[PDB]
Design a binder for this molecule. Sequence first.
Ligand SMILES: *Cc1c(COP(=O)(O)O)cnc(C)c1O
Ligand SMILES: *Cc1c(COP(=O)(O)O)cnc(C)c1O
Lengths: 321, 321
Amino acid sequence: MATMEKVFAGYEARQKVLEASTNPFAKGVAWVEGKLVPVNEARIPLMDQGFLHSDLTYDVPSVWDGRFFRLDDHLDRFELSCSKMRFKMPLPRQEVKRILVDMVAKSGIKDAFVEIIVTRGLKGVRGLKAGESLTNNLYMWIQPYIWVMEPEMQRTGGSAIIARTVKRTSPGSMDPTVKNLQWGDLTRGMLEAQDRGADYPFLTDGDGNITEGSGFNIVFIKDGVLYTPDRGVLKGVTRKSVADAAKANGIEMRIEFVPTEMAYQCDECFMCTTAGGVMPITSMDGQPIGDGKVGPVTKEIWDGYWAMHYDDKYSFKIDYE
Amino acid sequence: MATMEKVFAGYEARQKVLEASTNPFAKGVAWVEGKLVPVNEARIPLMDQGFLHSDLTYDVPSVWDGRFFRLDDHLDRFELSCSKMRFKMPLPRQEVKRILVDMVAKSGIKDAFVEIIVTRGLKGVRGLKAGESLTNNLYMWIQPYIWVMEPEMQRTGGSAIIARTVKRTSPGSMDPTVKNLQWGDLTRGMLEAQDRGADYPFLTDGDGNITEGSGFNIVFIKDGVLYTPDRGVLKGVTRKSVADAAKANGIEMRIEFVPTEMAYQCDECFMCTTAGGVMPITSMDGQPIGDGKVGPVTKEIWDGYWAMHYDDKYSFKIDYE
Ligand SMILES: *Cc1c(COP(=O)(O)O)cnc(C)c1O
Ligand SMILES: *Cc1c(COP(=O)(O)O)cnc(C)c1O
């Protein structure tokens, strides 16, 4: 569309400038043990329990056109995730925010993926002896904005399959509201999608309901109403932003059980996530969804989501000096 | 017992020698990108997908009294795990074996924990573009033998709870026969055990059956017969060695559905794993199991397991030169 072309033209112009930069942080920068290092040189201890037992939680805010998007909502969710895991995040919130902004500013990156991780640290829960306390670790980094669905694919939509060989990890085993890197099911789904000649996997709960996919929530549009699963999934900030844009435009959105049959009967579909935004799906199990083009309500939400990036209710300008 | 005292006296004597060594590898040694580094200096790339999405498998053989125990069974299982994950292990099997043995020899460690990991590498499955191929990474290390249950606790047994707040990750989400580091459920179980004043968590499948715990298989003894769960668990090498020792002594062992009620009706119980061996459990949900002492069949298996460490069918001597 018109607004797709706007957003992407601006991104492509900024990318041209960034690709030409000699700033050693232009390809990204990490914070490790209080030091900034270029991201592709960053290393972590082999003995970190975030590696050894994936005992960590994380969050991913973003920067668009030099504006941090919903950073506070990310930090709020991350505090909740840290508490549910019994971590103590090693630096106060305000210091974390200041460091993230300085990192961005230092790098010159205008459109950024940001990741924050807290891990159990160098000593595990399994080994704990009487009297001992654990010190948790923090890792953060900025890189150029990652696209789960590239811009050119967002214009046409991508393809999906309903995964048949795996189901989403039950909340009784791992709470899917705690953003985590334990992607065993998600990775199985990706491999299935590859095998089946589809771009993206949608996992069910194994009981006839749609959940989420490999790093994204799932939204269906049917008879002018948005539907998205309630249980079994991460409470996305992108999905919240979709609800905000729906409300702003008078579009109903239901957060509820979504049966698998919706994937075959929907009028439109899109995935949503911070790394990419609103990502239309125009094929399902090898068949076009309607006419196979990106639908009107999807584009209305798409435009609304990107407009929020310039609204001071949901974003703030970074001073790059 | 008599054989407990034998094994542990030998270990304590060897540990005294190791604690006195100035070898820079005596605290452990890792192999990273073809170089040996002291384990507590070893680092991995932040961008490794083994960290970023826990997209890895691993295995843990061991060395006892300068003898590698069942190394081939570990390498066989690890090949299977690598294939199920669609990894190509970066070095041939024979080279991996030679490197592991050289590492041990170089370190001087007689009683060792060994870990081998293969990860998806520096590029993820999610990001894959048309035409691209992935190169997987290898990490290996040796350290002094880790005890999931310390020697002194093996003499008395430890305590367990049947976990009520978590269930083992279903094979429909993550195959538990592929040894993995995605411990979300296991870590929840450990925290529950701590909360409940018990040493170890036993997880159910959420359908009335016992599975495994936080890095160990679970064995019950009832009316002179060993019972251990079939589905939902890793096919331990320790559990296989238990079956071997049972057979050698005319003790029946059933690998089958184990209802939760067995935890409350058993005559004896033990956990088993490479990092510790045979680990008696003498309390369950806060109540002693029988007289609360380590039982006779448990000790018969315990002695048998350690005898196997000196049998050339199941072990080989390392030349330390
Ligand atoms: C990150 C993520 C999402 C999206 O959450 P956002 O807050 O919108 O970025 C959805 N599901 C999974 C599994 C994720 O990892
Ligand atoms: C390693 C492990 C076991 C034990 O396997 P062994 O081959 O005997 O060391 C059992 N269950 C889990 C979850 C494990 O990680």
